[PDB]
C-alpha cells in the first residue's frame, strides 16, 4: 500500500519547487515518489474540451465546470496512487471570482484519502516579490493582504481535511534563502 | 434549479444592508432574488411559542432550543428556494453564552445546499462604531478584540461549509462610506 | 440525557488544571461531573500493547497505530458518558512531526457527540514561560510563533467540530494569576 502526500501553497510560495527538489533528494536515498500536478491533470481535460488555452484560465471558469473537471482529475490521480507512491502538488483552496473553492472537497478528499497534507508558507512579502519576478505564469499580483487572506483560508480548509480523513496537516516554511531547510523538513516528514 | 446565496457577517457589519441594496439594484434589470433573514424565520417561531419578545434574545436561549428552531427555519427556507432564487441573510456563527454556534450545522447546510457563502467583513473598529450608532437594535458593546475573535471563527466555519458542499466562499469588504463598492462586488459575483 | 464537555488546549495552557478546579467547585454545589483525560485512556491501551513507556512517546508513534488507539479510547470514553456527565481533557489537535493531527476526527467526534467544546487560551508568552518551569514533562520549548500556530489550528479544528455536531465552541482565557476567573467562567458556562 502506497503513501499519498498532498503539498499545498498559494501561487508563488514554492509548493512546486519544494516538491521537485524533494523527490530528487529522495531518489538519491533510494525512495520512489511520483510527482503529479493536480492543475495539469485538469488542464489536459479542460484543454481537450476547448474551455481554456492556458492553465491560469481555469480558476475563472464557471465553478460548476471546475468541480466537474476537479473530480475527473482526482479519479485519475487516485489511479496513480495504486501503482506508486505519489506527491500531489495542488492547492488547499483556489481563488475564483466567486470566492475560494476547496481544492479537496469531501468527495475528492475521500477518493485520494491523502496520508499527509503539507502547507507551504512564507510571509506575504516574499510571495508578492516572487510573483512580480516571473512572467512564466499569468499569476495574480494581489495585495499582500489578499495573499494573507488566502493563506488564512487555506489553513482552515486544510485543518478541515484532517478532521474528515484523519490526515495530519504539516506546515513547512519556505523562506527566501532557505529553500534547503524546507527540503530537509519535508524529507524528514516522508519517513 | 434556483440559486441559493448565503450572506454572512457579524452584527453591525452590514450583511442585511448589502443584501437589500444588491437585490433592489438587480430588480432594476429584472433579475429577481427573494431576501430571507434566517433570524426572522426563527423569531416568528420563537415568539409564537412565547420564548422571546425580540430577536436579540434568541442567542441567549438554551443552545438546544436554538438548534431546534434553527432546524425548522432551514427547512422552511429550503422550501422557499424551490419557488425563487434566494439570498439568505444569516450568520456563519452565532455568539451564544455557551460559545459560537454554527449557523449552518451540516444537516442545515445540506438542506439549503448553497452555491455561494458570502462573508461581509470590515474592521472591528468600524463595526463597534456602527453598533453604537444603531438605535434599531440592542447591539452588544463588546471589546473590539471580541469582534475580531468572532470574525476569525466565522471564517473558520465558512471554509468548512465550502469543504462539505463545494460552495465557494467569497469575502467582501463593506467599508465606511463604501457600501456601493460592496454592492457592485456582490452584483458582479451574482452574474 | 448526560452532558459531554470537551476541554482542549495546547500543552502548558492549563486545560488539565482548569478541569480539576472546576469539578471541585461544582461538587460543592452538588453537581457531579467525572474527569477523563483522553491521553491517559490512550496510554493505558498503549502500554498494555507495549508501544511506549511514557505518554509523551505516544504522539511520535505510527499515526496508523495512534488512530487505532484514539479510536478505541474515544469508544471507551463514550461508555463513561452513558453513566454520568463527563468532562474530557484532551486536545483539538496534537502536534506531531508529521503535522497537526485532529484529536476528534469525525468518527471519534460522532462517538462522543460533545455538547460544548471549550478552548483554553492565553498569550504564547505565558504558555512558553509555563513550559520552562515544568519538570513533569520534558515540555516542548517551541518558539512563541509555533505556539501561536498551534492555537490558530486548534481554533480551525474546533469550529469544524461545531459544524459537524452542533456543539457550541467556547473560548476561555486562562491568564497568569487569574485561574480562579477562568474557573468562574467555565462553571457559569456549565449551568
Ligand atoms: N525558498 C525560496 N527562496 C527564493 N525563491 C524561491 C524559493 N522557493 C521558491 N522560489 C521561487 O519562487 C517562485 C515560485 O515558485 P513555485 O510556486 O515553486 O512555482 C519560483 O520562481 C521559485 O524559484
Ligand atoms: N485541487 C484543485 N481543485 C481545483 N482547481 C485546482 C486544483 N489544483 C489545481 N487547480 C487549478 O489548476 C491551476 C494550476 O495549478 P498550479 O499549477 O498548481 O498553480 C490552478 O490555478 C487552479 O485553477
Ligand atoms: N458601508 C457602510 N458604511 C456606513 N454605515 C454602514 C455601512 N454598511 C452598513 N452600515 C450601517 O451599519 C449598521 C449595520 O447594519 P446592518 O448590519 O446591515 O443591519 C446600520 O446602521 C447600517 O445602516
Ligand atoms: N443560521 C442561524 N442559526 C442560528 N441562529 C441564527 C441564524 N441566523 C440568525 N440567527 C439568530 O437570529 C438573530 C437575529 O439575526 P440577525 O437579524 O440576522 O442579526 C441572531 O442574533 C441569532 O440569534
Ligand atoms: N484526542 C487525542 N488524539 C490523539 N492523541 C491524543 C489525544 N488526546 C491526547 N492524546 C495523546 O495523549 C498525550 C497526553 O495528553 P495530555 O496529558 O492531555 O497532554 C498527547 O500528547 C497525545 O499524544
Ligand atoms: N492561570 C494560570 N496561571 C499560572 N499558572 C497556571 C495557570 N493555569 C495553569 N497553570 C500552570 O501551568 C502549567 C501547565 O498546565 P497544564 O497544561 O495543566 O499542565 C502547570 O504548572 C499549571 O499549574
Ligand atoms: Mg506550482
Ligand atoms: Mg442584519
Ligand atoms: Mg494536561
Amino acid at each position: 500500500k502506497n503513501k499519498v502526500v498532498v503539498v499545498t501553497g498559494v501561487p508563488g510560495v514554492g509548493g512546486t519547487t519544494l516538491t521537485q527538489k524533494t523527490i530528487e533528494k529522495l531518489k538519491e536515498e533510494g525512495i520512489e515518489y511520483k510527482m503529479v500536478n493536480f492543475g495539469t491533470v485538469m488542464f489536459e481535460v479542460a484543454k481537450e474540451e476547448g474551455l481554456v488555452e492556458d492553465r491560469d484560465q481555469m480558476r475563472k471558469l464557471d465553478p460548476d465546470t471546475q468541480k466537474r473537471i476537479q473530480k475527473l482529475a482526482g479519479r485519475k490521480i487516485a489511479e496513480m496512487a495504486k501503482e506508486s507512491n505519489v506527491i500531489v502538488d495542488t492547492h488547499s483552496t483556489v481563488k475564483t471570482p466567486k470566492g475560494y473553492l476547496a481544492g479537496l472537497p469531501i468527495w475528492v478528499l475521500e477518493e485520494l484519502n491523502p496520508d499527509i497534507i503539507v502547507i507551504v508558507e512564507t510571509s506575504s512579502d516574499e510571495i508578492l516579490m516572487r510573483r512580480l519576478g516571473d512572467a512564466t505564469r499569468n499569476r495574480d499580483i494581489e495585495l499582500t493582504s489578499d495573499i494573507d487572506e488566502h493563506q488564512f483560508m487555506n489553513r482552515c480548509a486544510a485543518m478541515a481535511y484532517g478532521v474528515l480523513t484523519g490526515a495530519t496537516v504539516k506546515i513547512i516554511k519556505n523562506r527566501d534563502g532557505l529553500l534547503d531547510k524546507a527540503v530537509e523538513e519535508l524529507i524528514s516528514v516522508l519517513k
Side-chain angles (χ1 to χ4, degrees), chain A residues 6-108:
Chain A
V6 164
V7 173
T8 74
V10 302
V13 80
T16 299
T17 299
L18 177 61
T19 299
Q20 311 185 296
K21 294 290 180 202
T22 289
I23 287 174
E24 183 183 2
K25 291 301 290 180
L26 292 171
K27 293 175 183 172
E28 302 172 19
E29 290 164 22
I31 304 171
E32 300 284 349
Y33 275 82
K34 177 187 282 187
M35 194 191 170
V36 185
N37 182 267
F38 203 110
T40 300
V41 181
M42 294 180 67
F43 183 58
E44 276 149 359
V45 181
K47 178 172 173 63
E48 180 184 15
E49 293 175 0
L51 304 171
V52 292
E53 297 76 354
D54 69 41
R55 64 168 48 217
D56 283 323
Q57 292 164 333
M58 293 192 305
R59 64 185 174 272
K60 297 275 186 299
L61 289 162
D62 191 341
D64 289 342
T65 303
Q66 293 188 55
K67 280 174 285 183
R68 168 174 60 85
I69 288 172
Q70 183 186 61
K71 185 170 185 184
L72 293 174
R75 284 166 66 193
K76 298 191 287 184
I77 296 169
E79 300 283 316
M80 293 172 186
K82 293 184 188 287
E83 291 166 0
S84 65
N85 295 317
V86 61
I87 305 188
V88 185
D89 167 15
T90 186
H91 300 276
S92 181
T93 71
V94 175
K95 191 157 189 152
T96 89
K98 308 246 180 285
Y100 297 93
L101 176 77
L104 308 174
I106 187 173
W107 56 89
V108 169

Side-chain angles (χ1 to χ4, degrees), chain A residues 8-16 120-122 127 130-131 139 151 174:
Chain A
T8 74
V10 302
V13 80
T16 299
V120 186
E121 294 182 340
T122 187
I127 304 173
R130 289 172 191 175
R131 292 181 182 184
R139 278 292 172 53
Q151 300 204 113
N174 181 28

Side-chain angles (χ1 to χ4, degrees), chain A residues 12-13 122 126-134 174-176:
Chain A
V13 80
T122 187
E126 294 184 350
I127 304 173
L128 179 59
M129 205 68 13
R130 289 172 191 175
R131 292 181 182 184
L132 299 175
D134 221 4
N174 181 28
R175 303 197 178 286
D176 284 0

Side-chain angles (χ1 to χ4, degrees), chain A residues 92-159:
Chain A
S92 181
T93 71
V94 175
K95 191 157 189 152
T96 89
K98 308 246 180 285
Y100 297 93
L101 176 77
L104 308 174
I106 187 173
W107 56 89
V108 169
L109 192 62
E110 279 179 7
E111 185 58 30
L112 291 200
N113 189 16
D115 298 305
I116 302 177
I117 292 171
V118 172
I119 306 169
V120 186
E121 294 182 340
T122 187
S123 77
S124 58
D125 265 6
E126 294 184 350
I127 304 173
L128 179 59
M129 205 68 13
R130 289 172 191 175
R131 292 181 182 184
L132 299 175
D134 221 4
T136 222
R137 301 285 295 265
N138 301 344
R139 278 292 172 53
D140 196 5
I141 63 185
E142 326 186 280
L143 300 174
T144 55
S145 61
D146 290 321
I147 297 161
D148 291 326
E149 190 184 290
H150 197 171
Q151 300 204 113
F152 191 117
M153 298 306 265
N154 288 340
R155 281 182 180 187
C156 300
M159 201 62 246

